[PDB]
Design a protein around this ligand. Structure first.
Ligand code: AMP
Lengths: 194, 194, 194
């Protein structure tokens, strides 16, 4: 399975687009799997003892976390080798905004274990992302004060994703998520895996 | 020792802010060391005959600067091991303007010796930085002619620091140094270390 | 020999600038070699039987191209150590635009084998790049639709070149290619190599 990492800053509509990518690939009868990196990390944590739930996993020693990310990364690469023909997409972050600053989602020890073909950056107009902050308060962590915060996050995601791309030899692709339709992004993503 | 790297372009008030961090951590009795990267570079340079003053080290061939960089990094790595517990702040740069172009302050061979937790980008409005540079003649710097050169250097600092963050697994925090109030930045810096 | 990597996005006048670097150095009797990374790749293909022309080379498996990229990188490093004093310049790309997104021209497994001192980024005004687009069809590049795509390509190139510079510890030099005279750029390239 050819691997593609789909990243997006909160509010871009990454879950809707991913739902559309699966729907379109199933309809063409094309083998595909969509893995949520955080969920697979937790699954990995459960299988190897490290922790029994998220809070437990999150309050873990930095040296343990780095091991766990490596094992999850190795695990996902296995899933891809085992699934044969198809497309495996990872749903993760290029950068995670934290109070302590931007944390790269694909650091060297993770990215070179996975070796993806493509890293996607889901972007939209900062205005459209601010509207999707108060329109759908399905988490509402209201971290995006003004659009200058969104812009800055977009940019750090761009810098971090390219640095991860340079490490693995993968391409970086910007995909605009159209407000109306999620199918535009979904087809651009599918076109890129060809 | 928990390492935090504090970078900033010349004129952001890196020192002002760093003094205030020592004040605040000394006053609450927390063990903290503040090392200036360039001071360690100059020591090694002086003993080898490469340069006499800090403002000439950046004019050196890329290969000599690389040598000083590795030596300094090995030194600071040693001081961090003999610190036991508490916060170590490395006062340095994300990028160094040189006749040969921008030299990354935290290349892979430096990042592997230190392994910071957080990498800070101290920033300020370019107009405010342009002024601060003319008020200091214990340094100088004729390369910061207009506001265009400062923007471009703030950007390369961002690109470079994020690439370094991605290699290390560390976070990158942009801190605005509020004109006239070093304690804001100093406190964001302290909170981010927790 | 000191290694310099000269990159530019299509349409900046890189081959012209590279010719002046050769003439100015010849008329100074400085030893210099100017290698095209893809050509060196092609050469290694032939002498290993993989491919026979640029066209059949660009069709090879991903694992095969990667093979060619490493050996070519290693090879170019031997050529520079063998060549004694002097300046070796590699003409390649910082990023390449592909249907899958931006492909880093200097991934880790390549930049760490070459270990340049300088990575140059030739830029020009977007308008100028477009102006040369209608003017020459040695090629006929109809990929640059508008100036916003030129801008994006430029930033990705900076992002990637900086990341590559952080892995090898090389500088990143932006060189503006002036439209009237290609010597402004070649003198800067040469100055930067001292
Ligand atoms: N991490 C670094 N890598 C390379 N050169 C550095 C680094 N940190 C500082 N320098 C150099 O040391 C000089 C003085 O440091 P500063 O006193 O903090 O300006 C700089 O202008 C650079 O020439």
């Amino acid at each position: 399975m050819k691997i593609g990492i789909v990243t997006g800053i909160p509010g871009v509509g990454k879950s809707t687009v991913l739902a559309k990518v699966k729907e379109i690939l199933d309809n063409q009868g094309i083998n595909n799997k969509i893995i949520n990196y955080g969920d697979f990390m937790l699954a990995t944590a459960l299988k190897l003892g490290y922790a029994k739930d998220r809070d437990e996993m999150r309050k873990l020693s930095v040296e343990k976390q780095k091991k766990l990310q490596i094992d999850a990364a190795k695990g996902i690469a296995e899933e891809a080798r085992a699934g044969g023909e198809g497309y495996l997409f990872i749903d993760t972050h290029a950068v995670i905004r934290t109070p302590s600053g931007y944390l790269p989602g694909l650091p060297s020890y993770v990215i070179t274990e996975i070796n993806p073909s493509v890293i996607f950056l889901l972007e939209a107009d900062p205005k459209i992302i601010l509207s999707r902050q108060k329109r759908d308060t399905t988490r509402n962590r209201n971290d995006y004060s003004d659009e200058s915060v969104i812009l800055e996050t977009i940019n750090f995601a761009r810098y971090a994703a390219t640095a991860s791309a340079v490490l693995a030899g993968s391409t970086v692709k910007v995909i605009v998520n159209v407000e109306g339709d999620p199918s535009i992004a979904a087809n651009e993503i599918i076109r890129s895996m060809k």
